[PDB]
Amino acid sequence: LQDLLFSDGNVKAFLQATTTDENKTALQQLLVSNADVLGLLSGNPTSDNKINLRTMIGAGVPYSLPAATTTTLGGVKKGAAVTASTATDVATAVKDLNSLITVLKNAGIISL
Amino acid sequence: LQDLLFSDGNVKAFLQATTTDENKTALQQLLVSNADVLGLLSGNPTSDNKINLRTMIGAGVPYSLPAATTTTLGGVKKGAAVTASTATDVATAVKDLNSLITVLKNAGIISL
Structure with a gap:
């Protein structure tokens, strides 16, 4: 019937x-118009979809x-320990x- | 029929x-109950949806x-190169x- x-x-x-993956792709398209969201619903968004999905939710990359x-x-990196100076001559101060x-x-x- | x-x-x-964007919004609501996921499926999540979607998957911001x-x-920044000291007087050591x-x-x- x-x-x-x-x-x-x-x-x-x-x-x-009972839907195949192809049926699901077509049904997603009847339900959602945003191309990047359709990329998400596929489970396999393109590189462009991924960028746009992050923009869409204001997310950053790792x-x-x-x-x-x-x-x-x-x-x-934090520097190693350095002792306060008790120098009484120039040689030691240096x-x-x-x-x-x-x-x-x-x-x-600092640079070498 | x-x-x-x-x-x-x-x-x-x-x-x-054949679904319009409005039909798709309504059909999404029949399929998914989480409000932040519905935001994602729209392709245009609100600021609140974005925060909650990141929380949901444990993602960070850029x-x-x-x-x-x-x-x-x-x-x-790494410091410029500095030569080891060969000073034999106070003036040079300083x-x-x-x-x-x-x-x-x-x-x-270090601070100025």
């Missing part, structure tokens, strides 16, 4: 409660913290300054 | 395999690495310490 009453085969499969560069904000410089160089806080 | 058999107009459009501050963890300080200041590793 459903064959006598309905022409569309995708509708008929829905009414029989963020990876980059190392600091001389031009670009980034993360650093030794202590250099220890700080190396620590900051080791942590990528 | 479909007009004689079914009262709901959105169902009837589905059975004819991460931007902030510069380090005195209160908040952040990225740094010159070398100051070179390290400026490098760390230039890279925003």
Whole structure:
């Protein structure tokens, strides 16, 4: 009787409660007009769909913290411990300054 | 015959395999109860839907690495190169310490 009453085969499969993946694609298209949402409903959105779906919900991509560069904000590693200076001569004061410089160089806080 | 058999107009459009965007909104509502998922299926989720959709899948927003501050963890730029010290007097040792300080200041590793 459903064959006598309905022409569309995708509708008929829905009414029989047995749909193929192709029937489901067509039925999705009857229910939703946004192309990126149709991409989501397929379970296999294209690259363009993915970008647009994130825009649609205001989502970001997985963020990876980059190392600091001389031009670009980034993360650093924390420098090793450095002892306060008790230097009473120039040689030792210079030794202590250099220890700080190396620590900051080791942590990528300043350039080599 | 479909007009004689079914009262709901959105169902009837589905059975004819021709749905408007309004029909699709109504059919989505027959198929899915979660309001944030319905927002996604529209292709135009509200701000609230977007937040809830990310929560739903455990997704984060696009991460931007902030510069380090005195209160908040952040990225740094790597400091310029600094030569090891071969100072034999106080004046030179102080010159070398100051070179390290400026490098760390230039890279925003320490405050001005």
